[PDB]
């Protein structure tokens, strides 16, 4: 059934997903890179994208590609 809905190598796109007291939180960052086979050694902090009141529980996930 239908529900809530919303609308908003060369690079590294880094993300964090977490679910707390009925809210789903997404954080991200983008950077240039000069390494292919691993995460590049250094530091930068992921900024919040969205904070969504969805109430849903999660135990599994998968990527779309």
């Amino acid at each position: 059934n239908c529900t809530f809905e919303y609308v908003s190598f060369k690079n590294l796109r880094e993300f964090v997903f977490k679910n707390i007291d009925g809210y789903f939180k997404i954080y991200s960052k983008h950077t240039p890179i000069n390494l292919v086979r691993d995460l590049p050694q250094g530091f930068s902090a992921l900024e919040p994208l969205v904070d969504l009141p969805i109430g849903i529980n999660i135990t599994r996930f998968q990527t779309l590609l």
Binding site: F4, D21, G22, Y23, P53, G55
Partner: protein, 49 residues
């Protein structure tokens, strides 16, 4: 249209309110005041009193 009022049509809307462990997706609108700078005041910004 010639019917007496007990027989005439009425439209009805029943507004039902639900509250659970899941967060509030609906709220009544919250009004805001004008802004006073350079004076001592009570304040509230986004619920920060």
């Amino acid at each position: 249209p010639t019917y007496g009022v007990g027989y005439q049509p009425y439209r009805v809307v029943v507004l039902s309110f639900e509250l659970l462990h899941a967060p509030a997706t609906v709220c009544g609108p919250k009004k805001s005041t004008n802004l006073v700078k350079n004076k001592c005041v009570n304040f509230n910004f986004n619920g920060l009193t």
